[PDB]
Amino acid sequence: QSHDEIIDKLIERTNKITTSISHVESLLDDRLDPKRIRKAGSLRHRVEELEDPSCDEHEHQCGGDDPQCISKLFVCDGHNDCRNGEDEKDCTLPTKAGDKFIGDVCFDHCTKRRPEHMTLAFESSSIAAFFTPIADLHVHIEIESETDEDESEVSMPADGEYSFADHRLTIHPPEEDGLGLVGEFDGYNFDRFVGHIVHELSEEVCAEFIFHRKK
Amino acid sequence: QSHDEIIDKLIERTNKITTSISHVESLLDDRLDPKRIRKAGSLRHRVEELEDPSCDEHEHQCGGDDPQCISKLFVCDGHNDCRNGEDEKDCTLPTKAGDKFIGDVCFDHCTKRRPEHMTLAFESSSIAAFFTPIADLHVHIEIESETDEDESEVSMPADGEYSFADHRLTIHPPEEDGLGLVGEFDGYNFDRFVGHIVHELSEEVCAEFIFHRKK
Amino acid sequence: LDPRLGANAFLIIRLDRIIEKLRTKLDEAEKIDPEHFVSEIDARVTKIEGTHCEKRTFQCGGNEQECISDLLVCDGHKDCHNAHDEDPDVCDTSVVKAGNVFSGTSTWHGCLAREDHVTRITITASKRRKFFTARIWLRALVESELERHGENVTSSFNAKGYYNFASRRLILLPTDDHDDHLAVVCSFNRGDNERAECHRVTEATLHQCADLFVTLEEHD
Amino acid sequence: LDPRLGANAFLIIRLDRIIEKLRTKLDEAEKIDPEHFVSEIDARVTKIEGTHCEKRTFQCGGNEQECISDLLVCDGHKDCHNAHDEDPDVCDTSVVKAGNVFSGTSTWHGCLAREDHVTRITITASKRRKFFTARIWLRALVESELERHGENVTSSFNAKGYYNFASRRLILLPTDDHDDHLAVVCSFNRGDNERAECHRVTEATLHQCADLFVTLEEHD
Amino acid sequence: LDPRLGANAFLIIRLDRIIEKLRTKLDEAEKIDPEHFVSEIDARVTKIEGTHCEKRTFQCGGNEQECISDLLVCDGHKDCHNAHDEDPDVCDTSVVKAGNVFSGTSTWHGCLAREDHVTRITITASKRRKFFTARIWLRALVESELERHGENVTSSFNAKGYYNFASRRLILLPTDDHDDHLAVVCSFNRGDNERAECHRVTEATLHQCADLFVTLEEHD
Amino acid sequence: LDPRLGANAFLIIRLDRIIEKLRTKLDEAEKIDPEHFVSEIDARVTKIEGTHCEKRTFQCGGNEQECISDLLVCDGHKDCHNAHDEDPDVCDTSVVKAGNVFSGTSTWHGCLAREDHVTRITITASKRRKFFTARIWLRALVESELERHGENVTSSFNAKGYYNFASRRLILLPTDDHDDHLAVVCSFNRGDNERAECHRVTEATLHQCADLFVTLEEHD
Amino acid sequence: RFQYLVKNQNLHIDYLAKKLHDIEEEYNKLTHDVDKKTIRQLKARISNLEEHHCDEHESECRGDVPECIHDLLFCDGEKDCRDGSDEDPETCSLNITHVGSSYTGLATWTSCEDLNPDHAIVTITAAHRKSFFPNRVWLRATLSYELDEHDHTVSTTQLRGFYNFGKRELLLAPLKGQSEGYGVICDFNLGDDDHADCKIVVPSSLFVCAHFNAQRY
Amino acid sequence: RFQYLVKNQNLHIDYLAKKLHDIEEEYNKLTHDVDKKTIRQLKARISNLEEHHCDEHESECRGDVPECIHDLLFCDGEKDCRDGSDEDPETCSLNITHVGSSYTGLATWTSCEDLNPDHAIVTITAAHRKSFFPNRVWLRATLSYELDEHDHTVSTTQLRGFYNFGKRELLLAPLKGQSEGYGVICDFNLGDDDHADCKIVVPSSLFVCAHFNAQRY
Ligand SMILES: [Ca+2]
Ligand SMILES: [Ca+2]
Ligand SMILES: [Ca+2]
Ligand SMILES: [Ca+2]
Ligand SMILES: [Ca+2]
Ligand SMILES: [Ca+2]
Ligand SMILES: [Ca+2]
Ligand SMILES: [Ca+2]
Ligand SMILES: [Ca+2]
Ligand SMILES: [Ca+2]
Ligand SMILES: [Zn+2]
Ligand SMILES: [Zn+2]
Ligand SMILES: [Zn+2]
Ligand SMILES: [Zn+2]
């Protein structure tokens, strides 16, 4: 009631606040939830795609409340070319060695197997020390086919690069049938990208697969 | 990175949990929120009033999942008369010395002043050591009237008791006009009670005021 | 750094007492169930309002209100517009699952000079004719731990009866036990399958000899 | 600098005891009020000097001295040259606000063989005719905790009367209580509205049966 | 108990760093506003969908869609069925409150060999005819910190114009400054009153000489 | 008891280093596999003893020895008395699963003045006719990182061929690459599906131009 | 040598995390709180069984004091209730009389047509509130009820009427001159603006031809 | 002598409480999160401007893979979409075709009647789903639109039709033999089950007589 009850009151009150504190720290973290950011930013992108092009054909938009067009050859090159800096603050390579991506077909008018799925394994990836804007990749495109007369499996290897310029990895044609893969990343996602199979020469789309990062 | 970064990781994690902990302690407190209890229990009462009487005229219901009727003369008497104990676990006197209650009229067919308000000040309150079921009170009923021919003020004093038996304080007639006050408490509230002004002899209701505890 | 690390413990030890005390709260919380209480009031009130259907009829969903004979109460064929007369929750067999035990105090006010004693209704068996689901036929054991000349005695008897989903009524009649026992009757009108309101009655008039509020006994 | 800072505390702890003891002094100070005491003497003396106005008349400001009939004492119309006969402080209704309670010892020397007991005058109600403000009409309850044959008894009665601003007199007559009670009469001549000088008297002769000095009871 | 109390401090000191770091988060949180961002997309998209009303007309509430001439845009009389053409938020005078300053980069692509420079539109004055509210008439100062032969120069001029609620357009023409300056034109289509999309143009053809995205400067 | 408990730790800390060092041993243990090594010797020796069946025939279980034509090697129909010619382990498709990569040093001694370089056989695709299982048809990529005039070059070519369970032979011929590449031929006679013995040869005579021992590359 | 005290501390924590998850888990396996919209309906249902002093043509203030004021005085712009409850938004909500508003339930007829329980739908077709007389929101609606559950014929009578803020009752009658069909009375005394106790009446005597408890949408 | 260290500790705390309240306060003065029902409407509005491959008579699965299946196959009991999105509840919600359902907006006519923008109300009067043919929820409704904004006359035509799960479109036409009025098409491609893009058409050619963006209630 003195050196006993007046000491356990200046304690049960220390906690009664330590709660109200972390309680807010939560409500705050809820509005900074990065998962919410990308998810929303991702939505923004979809819109940016509908709007008339913000910059010329071969230029990179730096966004922000004050736009600036710089050459795509400058995105992630080591030099601060944009006032805001976008051209240099987001240079993380998504498809890096070891990573695997599973694609679910949804429109196939050309592949030789018209497969249900299509795995995309990234073997190696190296960036040239003097040209940061492009990372070169080596990939194995795996496929599990199965008909009546037989049952085949495939793992065609192909070279390819990833351009931080527009988050688009181009995978050079594996087989000599003029068919290559071109997946362009969301910008904020990186665990799912639409993969278009095209005729390199023409650039004709003839197969769409939604690729998910196999985690 | 060793005795520096491995020590601030076994710390920023201690908190990362101390949050998830108090986070739940909150969700729990939210379902035990006493303010919610009474508020709901209060609702229960309103219903108990519509249902046929649970016990005889002069008996107290102990409630619970197994009901038992005991004499009202046993509620808060010092002896454990009910199996569950209700008759003895809720014996807190609401209107105790010092307390003031403001009543808002809403139906007045008898008071001499047909006043807009009506203050109820509790001067003294004492309980007889051997008869706990009834607490005796001394109250001053204040009134602020004001007409054309004059402007009166009143502070009539009256005796009265509070029966834990049914949370009903009876205030004996102040003036010799056979008019007394009878307010019955919610059971769970205690900061608001409906005050009926009646003719003691008859027990006729002729004035209703909602009394709020002036806090 | 022995201090910042050896002290970061007096910080953790706290969470240990906290997390523990927190266990006690989660125990208190399970006792004060809202979605349950509310249901008690709903049923409590609906009892006053009274189903808008004549005796022996089943009232359907508060939206598409309509009366159904309890011979279809829960027969397997969609009879109400909202099919509320086949809604699983209405026909939970578990209310009177064999092995369920209900106890409570039986206050007498009608046909016996008995002191407030306890009754213990326990379901013995329960058949459900596959060609007539509207009723759960069942056998049960009724015991009454009451005090008589001297010490504690036990007046028990075997019973047979049925459970009606429509009214959530459980009727238990004596198995011809020629010792003249009062048939027990329970209604599970309380918003749950745990508690029921019972009465001891004469099989003939159904006149109420006593009030009995039972509760399903916990199995732990 | 652990010393100059850890010691600058033994300096602050001091102010803590000081500030506290200082609270006690502010309590002692409220009891010895000067502007109040002085007023007691003023009134005390004016009582000896005596208003220079004939009975039933109101004396105005010590500068523009002049007599006014208490039928205007405080009627709402400026009657004195200095208007002191409408000065708020003269007509503070609060002196006899309903609910005010005055207690004190009633020493008897005239019409009763009573032992020095206490009287408790408490204002029940108070009307003030809007067309005649010069008077506060009021009802009150007079109680007298006195000892008689055996133990403590209470001789009380209801009273009706009025308060006159001009003379700060409060007259309370019995509400025809045919038990023959002595009308009480108080004057608030003491420089404040808290204390008053009273006497029990016969309504007829106004002969003084007893002396009673009351004080307004604190509400805390 | 020097230990449990002197240690209960190392517990409080924690909350001190916490509460502080928490301040930083509340600062980060104010930068990432959702209800605002969403609005940017709404407007961003509505811009693509395009109001279903012909040029110079005001589209009303997405529920009771209907076209109104901007001569009523915000005139004081309920013209739309939903009255959205008088909704306060549509006619916030503050968008172009006198004293507001907008800056931003002006990229040139049409009528001048200028290097990407900055323009600074600042509202000088703003009258609003009480008998014709549909428009905010205003004067403003346009400055352009651009580099020429040598160092930093400043090509500024005074302008007069108006703000139209209906289209949230701000038109600023030169005050006959015979130095031939390109009239500026801003639209506040961005979901807020802080940012606007502008263009420098020829008052005649309204041909777009340059793109300019301004932002209201903070006053702290 | 601070000592017996605070010391019982120096006892546990030990198990921590132990358990860790123990991890290293479990790593060393995975490298020295017995049931595998033994198999290497079995096959190694059986190679000397030589299957008692004529070329292009499959030897069955060491108990019920008997010869089967590799056109049935693994066709789906029980052909041997012990059915060893359908035993799963004989027809593990995985030996040459598409995506498998084999590397190793190619020492030349027959048709090219090449310095000991490395070859990298990697299976591109693999079909298996459902009406003729006895063979795995496959396409593959053969690369040879060899040094020529100056620095590191790469002489690669696409190949087509088949895998025969009976002999665990993998034959890879050039896809008509008119650059004249030596067909590669591997036998997985080593007791496992990881290692194989290869030779570069002329598709005509099958004359051996070089020795190449490959190993399946780890995928981690 | 150094992590000897840390390697386990992180464990004592990895511990708490579990003893807690095994709690947050046992939590979810517990009935959640009830939507306030439910309690509201109870307080309503209940408040409807309790005794009420307001005499016909009068409804009680929504305040804390159950004062009774005449129906003709709710939502008229002048504080008539002691506390002004007759004018606060929660009372004068037009939520009910909004154009297009539609309430339906299962009509079970007890007095004017063979028809076996069928679906009734009273939906608002237009409604204006005369600027100078706010007490009433004059409106027009349609009452439709299925005829033959098999070929799906359905009767659709046009109605006229108003909505009483006081009684919180929707009162509609046939337009006069169209096969003289039925009328309909809906009480929204159910607690919120989406549930009502409707009854198809005979315009003439307001006599209950059939009853149907309705919901909104 | 003893509280000399406590009397202030409680102060250091009474302190934090304030430095925090002055935070929780500056918090509320910040825009709250947006109701998911809003984002949903955006993702919708947006998704409607994006290019879509499904050819007339086909609608895309609601799954993550934008696969196109024929309209005649949604909600028929057999997983037709790669992932089964054509059969999950969020797709086959009857929420729209519920009896009594009513949608209204402001109809602004562009081709078949003098009428100046007036209120349009398409409300569902009855609707059954043939047990063996789930793809369609056959129904009946009423289309009402105000005539004279002054005397409040209002047209009420009865309709017949169904609701297409695929296109998420409500298609109603006049019953045939009642003044040959109009029909109505409502697309609920707006994201949720309460907003729709309705257009009053001429039954015969589905030609747009007028358009009105509707909401439910
Ligand atoms: Ca750059
Ligand atoms: Ca007791
Ligand atoms: Ca049935
Ligand atoms: Ca006067
Ligand atoms: Ca207007
Ligand atoms: Ca075989
Ligand atoms: Ca009013
Ligand atoms: Ca009938
Ligand atoms: Ca399907
Ligand atoms: Ca027109
Ligand atoms: Zn018995
Ligand atoms: Zn006396
Ligand atoms: Zn300029
Ligand atoms: Zn080679």
Short mmCIF file of N, CA, C and O in Angstrom, two decimals, chain B residues 112-113 123 138 140-144 146-157 175-176, chain D residues 93 96-101 122-132 139 141 143 158 217:
data_model
loop_
_atom_site.label_atom_id
_atom_site.label_comp_id
_atom_site.label_asym_id
_atom_site.label_seq_id
_atom_site.Cartn_x
_atom_site.Cartn_y
_atom_site.Cartn_z
N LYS B 112 -46.03 20.44 -8.84
CA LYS B 112 -46.60 21.76 -8.68
C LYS B 112 -46.00 22.76 -9.66
O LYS B 112 -46.68 23.70 -10.07
N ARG B 113 -44.75 22.55 -10.06
CA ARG B 113 -44.07 23.46 -10.99
C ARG B 113 -43.98 23.02 -12.46
O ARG B 113 -43.60 23.82 -13.32
N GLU B 123 -27.61 13.98 0.20
CA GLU B 123 -26.87 14.53 1.33
C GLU B 123 -26.14 13.44 2.12
O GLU B 123 -24.92 13.43 2.15
N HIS B 138 -30.85 10.43 2.69
CA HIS B 138 -31.40 11.75 3.00
C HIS B 138 -31.10 12.53 1.74
O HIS B 138 -29.94 12.65 1.33
N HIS B 140 -32.08 16.01 -1.00
CA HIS B 140 -32.63 17.34 -1.25
C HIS B 140 -33.02 17.36 -2.71
O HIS B 140 -32.19 17.12 -3.58
N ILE B 141 -34.30 17.62 -2.98
CA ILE B 141 -34.79 17.68 -4.35
C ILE B 141 -34.85 19.14 -4.76
O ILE B 141 -35.74 19.86 -4.34
N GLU B 142 -33.92 19.58 -5.58
CA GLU B 142 -33.85 20.98 -5.98
C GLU B 142 -34.66 21.27 -7.23
O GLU B 142 -34.77 20.42 -8.10
N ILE B 143 -35.23 22.47 -7.31
CA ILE B 143 -36.05 22.86 -8.47
C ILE B 143 -35.97 24.33 -8.82
O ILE B 143 -36.15 25.19 -7.96
N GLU B 144 -35.75 24.61 -10.10
CA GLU B 144 -35.64 25.98 -10.62
C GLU B 144 -36.86 26.40 -11.45
O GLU B 144 -36.87 26.24 -12.67
N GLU B 146 -39.88 29.35 -12.75
CA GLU B 146 -39.86 30.76 -13.17
C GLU B 146 -41.06 31.16 -14.02
O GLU B 146 -41.11 30.85 -15.20
N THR B 147 -42.00 31.89 -13.42
CA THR B 147 -43.20 32.33 -14.14
C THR B 147 -43.19 33.81 -14.49
O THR B 147 -42.12 34.43 -14.56
N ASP B 148 -44.38 34.37 -14.71
CA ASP B 148 -44.54 35.78 -15.05
C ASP B 148 -44.66 36.63 -13.78
O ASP B 148 -44.02 37.66 -13.65
N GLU B 149 -45.51 36.17 -12.86
CA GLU B 149 -45.76 36.86 -11.60
C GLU B 149 -44.63 36.71 -10.59
O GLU B 149 -44.57 37.45 -9.60
N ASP B 150 -43.73 35.76 -10.82
CA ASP B 150 -42.62 35.55 -9.91
C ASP B 150 -41.56 34.60 -10.46
O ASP B 150 -41.59 34.21 -11.63
N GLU B 151 -40.60 34.26 -9.61
CA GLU B 151 -39.53 33.34 -9.98
C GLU B 151 -39.04 32.65 -8.71
O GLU B 151 -38.29 33.22 -7.92
N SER B 152 -39.49 31.41 -8.53
CA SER B 152 -39.14 30.62 -7.35
C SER B 152 -38.05 29.58 -7.54
O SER B 152 -37.74 29.17 -8.65
N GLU B 153 -37.46 29.18 -6.42
CA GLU B 153 -36.42 28.17 -6.37
C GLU B 153 -36.81 27.29 -5.19
O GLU B 153 -37.35 27.79 -4.21
N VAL B 154 -36.55 25.99 -5.28
CA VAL B 154 -36.91 25.09 -4.18
C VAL B 154 -35.89 24.02 -3.93
O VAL B 154 -35.21 23.57 -4.85
N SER B 155 -35.78 23.60 -2.67
CA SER B 155 -34.85 22.56 -2.28
C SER B 155 -35.47 21.74 -1.15
O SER B 155 -34.96 21.73 -0.03
N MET B 156 -36.56 21.04 -1.46
CA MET B 156 -37.26 20.22 -0.49
C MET B 156 -36.45 19.00 -0.12
O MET B 156 -35.93 18.30 -0.99
N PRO B 157 -36.31 18.73 1.18
CA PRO B 157 -35.56 17.60 1.72
C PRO B 157 -36.49 16.44 2.03
O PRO B 157 -37.62 16.65 2.51
N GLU B 175 -43.10 17.15 0.29
CA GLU B 175 -44.19 18.04 0.71
C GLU B 175 -45.39 17.20 1.10
O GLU B 175 -45.56 16.07 0.63
N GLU B 176 -46.24 17.75 1.94
CA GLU B 176 -47.42 17.02 2.38
C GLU B 176 -48.53 17.05 1.31
O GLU B 176 -49.68 17.39 1.59
N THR D 93 -29.79 37.45 -4.22
CA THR D 93 -30.84 36.51 -3.86
C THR D 93 -30.25 35.34 -3.10
O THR D 93 -30.90 34.73 -2.26
N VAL D 96 -30.56 33.87 0.82
CA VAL D 96 -31.58 32.91 1.18
C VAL D 96 -31.98 32.08 -0.03
O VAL D 96 -33.15 31.96 -0.36
N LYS D 97 -30.98 31.52 -0.71
CA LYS D 97 -31.25 30.70 -1.87
C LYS D 97 -31.87 29.44 -1.33
O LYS D 97 -31.49 28.97 -0.26
N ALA D 98 -32.85 28.90 -2.05
CA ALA D 98 -33.49 27.67 -1.61
C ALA D 98 -32.39 26.62 -1.50
O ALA D 98 -31.55 26.49 -2.39
N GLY D 99 -32.37 25.88 -0.40
CA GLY D 99 -31.33 24.87 -0.26
C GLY D 99 -30.22 25.29 0.69
O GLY D 99 -29.37 24.48 1.09
N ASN D 100 -30.20 26.57 1.05
CA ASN D 100 -29.20 27.04 1.98
C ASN D 100 -29.60 26.52 3.36
O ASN D 100 -30.79 26.45 3.70
N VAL D 101 -28.61 26.14 4.15
CA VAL D 101 -28.88 25.63 5.47
C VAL D 101 -28.07 26.38 6.52
O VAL D 101 -26.87 26.56 6.39
N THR D 122 -33.33 25.66 7.46
CA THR D 122 -33.00 25.31 6.09
C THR D 122 -34.11 25.75 5.14
O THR D 122 -35.27 25.34 5.26
N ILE D 123 -33.75 26.61 4.19
CA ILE D 123 -34.70 27.15 3.24
C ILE D 123 -35.26 26.09 2.31
O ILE D 123 -34.52 25.50 1.54
N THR D 124 -36.56 25.89 2.38
CA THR D 124 -37.25 24.91 1.53
C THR D 124 -37.45 25.45 0.12
O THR D 124 -36.95 24.87 -0.84
N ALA D 125 -38.19 26.57 -0.01
CA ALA D 125 -38.48 27.20 -1.31
C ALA D 125 -38.38 28.72 -1.25
O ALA D 125 -38.27 29.28 -0.17
N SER D 126 -38.45 29.37 -2.41
CA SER D 126 -38.34 30.82 -2.47
C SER D 126 -38.88 31.46 -3.74
O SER D 126 -38.20 31.43 -4.76
N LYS D 127 -40.07 32.07 -3.67
CA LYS D 127 -40.67 32.75 -4.82
C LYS D 127 -40.36 34.25 -4.76
O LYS D 127 -40.15 34.79 -3.69
N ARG D 128 -40.32 34.90 -5.92
CA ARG D 128 -40.07 36.35 -5.97
C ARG D 128 -40.97 36.99 -7.02
O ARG D 128 -40.57 37.08 -8.19
N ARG D 129 -42.16 37.44 -6.61
CA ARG D 129 -43.14 38.07 -7.50
C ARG D 129 -42.49 39.05 -8.48
O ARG D 129 -41.95 40.06 -8.07
N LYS D 130 -42.57 38.76 -9.78
CA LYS D 130 -41.97 39.60 -10.81
C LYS D 130 -42.53 41.01 -10.86
O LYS D 130 -41.95 41.88 -11.49
N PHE D 131 -43.67 41.24 -10.21
CA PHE D 131 -44.30 42.57 -10.20
C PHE D 131 -44.09 43.27 -8.86
O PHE D 131 -44.65 44.34 -8.61
N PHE D 132 -43.28 42.65 -8.00
CA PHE D 132 -42.98 43.19 -6.67
C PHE D 132 -41.71 42.50 -6.16
O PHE D 132 -41.79 41.55 -5.36
N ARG D 139 -40.34 29.50 2.07
CA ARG D 139 -40.77 28.46 2.98
C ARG D 139 -39.47 27.85 3.49
O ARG D 139 -38.48 27.83 2.77
N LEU D 141 -37.57 24.97 6.70
CA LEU D 141 -37.71 23.93 7.70
C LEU D 141 -36.84 24.18 8.90
O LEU D 141 -35.62 24.22 8.78
N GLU D 143 -35.45 22.86 12.42
CA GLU D 143 -35.27 21.67 13.25
C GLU D 143 -34.48 22.04 14.49
O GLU D 143 -33.68 22.95 14.45
N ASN D 158 -42.48 23.25 9.95
CA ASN D 158 -42.39 23.92 8.67
C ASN D 158 -42.72 25.38 8.86
O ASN D 158 -43.59 25.71 9.66
N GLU D 217 -23.94 26.31 6.40
CA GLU D 217 -23.15 25.07 6.32
C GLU D 217 -22.44 24.88 4.97
O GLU D 217 -23.04 25.09 3.91
#
